[PDB]
A and B are shown apart, each in its own frame.
Chain A
Amino acid sequence: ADEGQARKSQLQRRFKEFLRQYRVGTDRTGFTFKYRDELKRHYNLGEYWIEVEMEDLASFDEDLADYLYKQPAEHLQLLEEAAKEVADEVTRPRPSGEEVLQDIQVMLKSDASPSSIRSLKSDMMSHLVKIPGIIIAASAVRAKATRISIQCRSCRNTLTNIAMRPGLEGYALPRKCNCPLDPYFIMPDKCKCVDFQTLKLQELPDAVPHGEMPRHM
């Protein structure tokens, strides 16, 4: 428990030294800081996303790019919280109209051989996978509360800044106000929202074992 945050404050510091130090190019020609420059050039345009590459992360610090393959959930958070502390010491002082620091959605690509939908055995639960396919559907974008704040009903006590977890998982509202049993409601005025879609991915046509209809995810 107390070693949890003490590990994190040592991972969120080694994920920050990766963006801040990784270079490319040789010594004869000349170098190029690959991710500071993209952070700056994407922030100043108003985009807020970098595209980290897994081979680079592996070649810089070999342990991190393994955690990221095994526990991607609780480590993408540290990565996206270091991308926000680096995009702060690079673009500041922001000129006039913006002075609140945005949030950086760290995507990530790779150059590794793809699996297939028929090779998703349950031992791959919560591991980065990489599958090809064909989009078959597309929902309409919706909202998804990220940082939500509630309020009691009778005594009007507030308990704010509550953070939702990402993905498709809800939240369990308390029942112990400290007032009737479940006195808590959501305050619609104070809840930050982000978009979210929901696609449908069909497996490539030349990989069906040819007795049936292709499966999808």
Chain B
Amino acid sequence: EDLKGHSVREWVSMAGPRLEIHHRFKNFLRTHVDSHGHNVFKERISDMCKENRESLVVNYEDLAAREHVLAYFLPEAPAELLQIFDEAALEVVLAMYPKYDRITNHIHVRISHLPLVEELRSLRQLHLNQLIRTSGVVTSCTGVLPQLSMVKYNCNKCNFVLGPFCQSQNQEVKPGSCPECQSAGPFEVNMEETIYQNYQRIRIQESPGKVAAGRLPRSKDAILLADLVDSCKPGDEIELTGIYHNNYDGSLNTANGFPVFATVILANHVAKKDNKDVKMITSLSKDQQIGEKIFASIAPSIYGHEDIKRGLALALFGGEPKNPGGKHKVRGDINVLLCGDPGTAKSQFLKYIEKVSSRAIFTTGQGLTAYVQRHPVSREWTLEAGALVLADRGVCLIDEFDKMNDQDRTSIHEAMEQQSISISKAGIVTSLQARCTVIAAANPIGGRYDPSLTFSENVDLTEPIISRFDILCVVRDTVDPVQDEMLARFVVGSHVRHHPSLPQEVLKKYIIYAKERVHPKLNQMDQDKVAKMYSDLRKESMATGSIPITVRHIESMIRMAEAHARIHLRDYVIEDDVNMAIRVMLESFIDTQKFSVMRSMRKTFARYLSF
């Protein structure tokens, strides 16, 4: 019988049950097919050995299926079953790969999804020394420090090395007296035979809105050992799985006045919960008319604005960040700046682009750069990342652009035309990288945009900042009767099917694909097709109270040139999307004009450009 009248901790520590368990795990490791006749732990061990990973995953449900007794012994006394399983998986691998001894000679078995997902505030004393699965954000991480694993001292009076004691993570190891000269004294470590292991400490805390309903959020410690270190960064959402181990602290006893012990989770498996084939895309891109079909895929709810849909779609995929051969460092980021009276779904345009995009971040304007911060766990005064370095390759969604402060304004402009920040702070003098595309929305002064003045008046923004934006869309309002029904019906219906009684699959994988497998080229047949427009329009604008299309608009137009290389996979400049580039670069300029000039320039060009 594999269950007799002892304590589960001490049943498994006996020689008989130990050997029985040892042999029982091998038979499961070697012979376990999964719904197709595949020895899963034959290919999985292989894929582990083709990378030198020394970490094997054991899904718990199958262990319970093929093994009824071990999957009940496990979360009772896991400080020894997870040790026996190690020596089992070793002898398996050293049979499937008899030379693997030259790679780390030690295997750890992780365990995946115990069936007992739990909260972080409901851990009571019942769970001391029991395997546990939890969840929550991580809010700190020290550096990867090396810790003793098999220490070995040396005596100071005999030149003899003491015994190889093992280090347990509750109390400093204590060597006795030298068995060679009885020289009991202050020994020192022997850096050459001692074995070390990585080490990292993190402070996990409850998820923001998940369980912290009407109270404050609790937290816990965790200790990631050798293979696990740097599995997670401050801000990630993870789900631990680890022994919940306590240890005596002398400080808490002197604050609370009672004998009180500290607790810590010795993590055993960390699995993040976040956000991480062409043959269709070939013909789907070769439709020759993917433009219309993609425009009405973003902005899924909000009706109208197929104008600004165009610009934002241009922005999303981006353009081409070519490096000029004259050391001029032209940028390949499209920055947008919405504006319009309150109540026109600007903020929703920001929030949906938060979702559809990847590696995106978000902020309000009412933290932009790295700042000195006292770490929650480590208690050292480190430096933490801001809000323009977390979009170092993706997008930065600014909200309430007007409410920025003078320091914030003098810091935002630097990153536009240089895309690189220096920090000579109290911490240390560094110069980091920031390559992000800015998507922001300002407000009209006086509670309403009025197009008698130029746009540079109702925006309430410093003038050399608006130049750092490529597109200038102006949102407004309408009282047209036939569209009142169109918008009403839509909203009402969207309130009928949301309550407890190109889709979002093509374009996400498409912004993943089309981001990568294209590199648009630049010929020189368009080089003269545009100047014929500039020579005219410069005079046309300077004639009146306005400043014509200047070089910082030609740059935006030439950037949006490639903005369609990502949608069509075209990647070759043609006189077709130049009709589009010029069209857009004037679209974002006629609106930001005067009362009668916004229409005089229209009567000229909107009929001239042959839209």
Contacts and interface: CB of A to CB of B under 8 A. Distances in A.
A116 interface: no
A125 B191 contact: yes
Contacts of A136: 428-430
B197 A122 contact: yes
B385 A125 contact: no
Q: How large is the interface on B (under 10, 10 to 19, 20 to 34, 35 or more residues)?
A: 20 to 34
B385 A210 contact: no
A203 B171 CA distance: 35
Q: How large is the interface on A (under 10, 10 to 19, 20 to 34, 35 or more residues)?
A: 20 to 34
B169 to A, nearest CB: 15
Residue of B186, B196, B226, B392 most packed against chain A (CB within 10 A): B196
A78 B430 CA distance: 41
B393 interface: yes
B192 interface: yes
Interface string B186-205: 10100110101110000000
A211 B272 CA distance: 15
Main secondary structure of the interface of B (DSSP, over half): loop
B432 A172 contact: no
Interface in B133-171: 143, 146, 156, 159
B370 interface: yes
A177 interface: no
B285 interface: no
A3 interface: no
Contacts of A125: 146, 191, 194, 196
B432 A213 contact: yes
A71 B192 contact: yes
B296 interface: no
Contacts of A205: 432-433
Nearest to B187: A172
B143 A215 contact: yes
A211 B233 contact: yes
Contacts of A215: 143
A111 interface: no
A74 B383 CA distance: 39
B188 A172 contact: yes
A213 B143 CA distance: 12
Contacts of B197: 122
A99 interface: no
A212 interface: yes
A121 B149 CA distance: 14
B192 A126 contact: yes
A181 interface: no
Contacts of B194: 125
Interface string A104-141: 00000000000000000111011000000000110000
B198 A172 contact: no
Contacts of B186: 172
A1 interface: yes
A126 B196 CA distance: 11
A73 interface: yes
B107 to A, nearest CB: 15
Nearest to A120: B144
Contacts of B104: 123
A122 B428 contact: no
A186 B393 CA distance: 59
Nearest to A210: B392
A1 B159 contact: yes
A153 to B, nearest CB: 20
A214 B196 CA distance: 24
Interface in B46-61: none
Contacts of B143: 215
Interface in B371-416: 383, 385, 390, 392-393
A212 B370 CA distance: 10
B156 A172 contact: yes
Interface string A61-89: 00000000001011000000000000000
A213 B385 contact: yes
Contacts of A172: 156, 186, 188
Interface in B85-139: 104
Contact of B196 (A71, A73, A122, A213): A122
Nearest to A202: B430
Nearest to A136: B428
Interface of A: 1, 71, 73-74, 121-123, 125-126, 136-137, 172, 202, 205, 210-215
Shortest Cβ-Cβ A-B pairs, 8 listed: A122-B196, A122-B146, A125-B196, A122-B198, A126-B191, A211-B233, A210-B392, A122-B197
16 contacts: A1-B159, A73-B191, A73-B192, A122-B146, A122-B198, A122-B226, A126-B192, A172-B186, A210-B392, A210-B393, A211-B233, A212-B385, A213-B370, A213-B432, A214-B430, A215-B143
Given A126-B192, A213-B385, 9 more contacts: A1-B159, A73-B191, A123-B104, A125-B146, A125-B194, A205-B433, A210-B392, A210-B393, A211-B233
